[PDB]
């Protein structure tokens, strides 16, 4: 079935490879920050942990390895580009799936990374035969278990425990201080709680971008290499355009195709269309970091098991903004409450500034938060933009509307979204006497009803004065700092 004489390996520039020191590795977010300036223009990068950093995989317990059942979905590789979704495949265990992968590669190739690459793209671009594989993707680790260890109180001290509390343990990365995802109380699946990816040969994850343009960290626990292709975030649009240009009929059929994660396009074609693509080979025991709005794709060289999770340093806050705004224009539903994260971050930073005002002891956390807030600070800039947006949106409301101050438990329990935008309304909501428990964003308050303003009101979580007070507090306004440290 293999045909190496017709291989179509795409000759693509390598994504940068980093070799963090133990020092660097003690501070995940800091290290990611230093990485930013060096690899953000590449979209993705490969991170090799310091020597002998190899956390034990609990999935290798044969109690889980041979018994824990997980679902798979069927991928027709020859259909990924030229031609729709993935259909329900048979249940597997890690043992079973590894055995079938061995069987598959034995049948298909009777095999190094570039051979598998050339053959894969051979199948995708040109289509001799139907090739059908399975992927156990997007498996909940809270259901299945994590590839990382957890703390067990009653048992002897072990390196496993140290790994369990390590920051690069993907169960711990999302809510590290410096990541605004910490301010989301719900253990959002995939975004905050890591997801598992069990692979076989040719197993694909098609072109896509993280939800809310978040950072993505992917650890390969065990098995064969995972090949990655990444696009820089600042070329995202370009990429998209090329898709529209090179798969016209598929986009005539599905204008929302990109968000469906079932379409693959070769890096060769992308290079010939002027889109910068960068290659990375993730081997067992290594990390792959995806930057905000960095389109990425790739496949598996054989049986493996990966674990991915989102992370959101302060620098992400400007992208995460655009995203939700974009979502509003796409009228697509979100995965998280952005304003909750922004406001949460601002509140924590204000708390730290308040502590410094009391000449409290400066901790590393306090330092990290102070460092990103002042009239030059990224957090300050983000909050400032959001507040400006708020004031313009309110300014554009015609006079009539009443104000009711939103009670704090307004987003707890229930996600509240603009009926038209699906814009998250954690900060502001508009309504009328026509529609209790039915709201719009400040931009679409107009479109909610036909009623006159007498009946129109707006739930506000914070008055405009209070918001501007927050911006001033980040810039050192002690009174404002006192104000927001109380909330």
């Amino acid at each position: 079935r293999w045909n190496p004489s017709e291989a179509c390996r795409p000759l693509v520039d390598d994504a940068p490879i980093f070799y963090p020191t133990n020092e660097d590795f003690d501070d995940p977010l800091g290290y990611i920050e230093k990485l930013r300036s060096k690899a953000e223009s590449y979209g993705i990068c490969r991170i090799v942990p310091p020597v002998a950093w190899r956390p034990p995989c609990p999935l290798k317990e044969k109690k889980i390895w041979e018994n824990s059942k997980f679902p798979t979905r069927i991928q027709f590789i020859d259909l990924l580009q030229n031609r729709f979704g993935f259909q329900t495949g048979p249940d597997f265990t890690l043992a079973a799936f590894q055995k079938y992968d061995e069987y598959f590669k034995e049948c298909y190739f009777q095999p190094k990374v570039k051979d598998l690459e050339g053959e894969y793209w051979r199948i995708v671009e040109q289509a001799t035969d139907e090739v059908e594989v399975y992927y156990g993707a997007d498996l909940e680790t809270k259901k299945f278990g994590s590839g990382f260890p957890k703390y067990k109180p009653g048992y002897p001290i072990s390196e496993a425990d140290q790994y369990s509390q390590c920051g690069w343990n993907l169960n711990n990365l999302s809510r590290l201080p410096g990541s605004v995802l910490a301010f989301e109380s719900c253990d959002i699946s995939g975004v905050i709680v890591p997801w598992l990816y069990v692979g076989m040969c040719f197993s694909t994850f098609c072109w896509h971008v993280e939800d809310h343009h978040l950072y993505s960290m992917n650890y390969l626990h065990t098995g064969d290499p995972k090949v990655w292709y990444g696009i820089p975030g600042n070329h995202a649009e370009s990429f998209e355009n090329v898709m529209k240009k090179r798969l016209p009929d598929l986009f005539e059929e599905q204008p929302d195709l990109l968000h469906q994660l079932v379409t693959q396009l070769s890096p060769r074609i992308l290079k010939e269309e002027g889109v910068p693509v960068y290659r990375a080979v993730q081997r067992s025991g290594e990390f792959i970091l995806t930057f905000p709005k960095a389109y990425h794709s790739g496949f598996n060289c054989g049986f493996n098991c990966a674990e991915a999770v989102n992370v959101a340093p302060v620098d992400w806050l400007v992208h995460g903004q655009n995203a939700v705004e974009g979502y509003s224009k796409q009228r697509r539903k979100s995965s998280l409450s952005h304003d909750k994260l922004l406001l949460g971050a601002a509140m924590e930073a204000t708390y730290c500034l308040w502590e410094l005002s009391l000449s409290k002891k400066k901790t590393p956390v306090i330092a990290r938060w102070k460092r990103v807030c002042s009239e030059d600070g990224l957090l300050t800039k983000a909050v400032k933009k959001r507040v400006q947006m708020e004031e313009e949106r309110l300014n554009h409301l015609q006079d009539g509307f009443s104000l009711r101050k939103m009670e704090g438990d307004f987003d707890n329990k229930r996600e509240r979204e603009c009926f038209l935008c699906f814009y998250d309304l954690h900060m502001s909501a508009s309504s009328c006497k026509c529609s209790p428990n039915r709201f719009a964003c400040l931009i679409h308050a107009k479109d909610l009803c036909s009623c006159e303003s007498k009946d129109r009101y707006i739930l506000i979580r914070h008055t405009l004065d209070e918001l501007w007070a927050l911006v001033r507090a980040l810039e050192g306004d002690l009174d404002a700092i006192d104000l927001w440290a109380s909330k």
């Binding site: 959002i188 699946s189 997801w195 994660l261």
Partner: peptide, 7 residues
């Protein structure tokens, strides 16, 4: 419920 995307 609250979730990441799936193909």
């Amino acid at each position: 419920a609250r979730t990441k995307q799936t193909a």
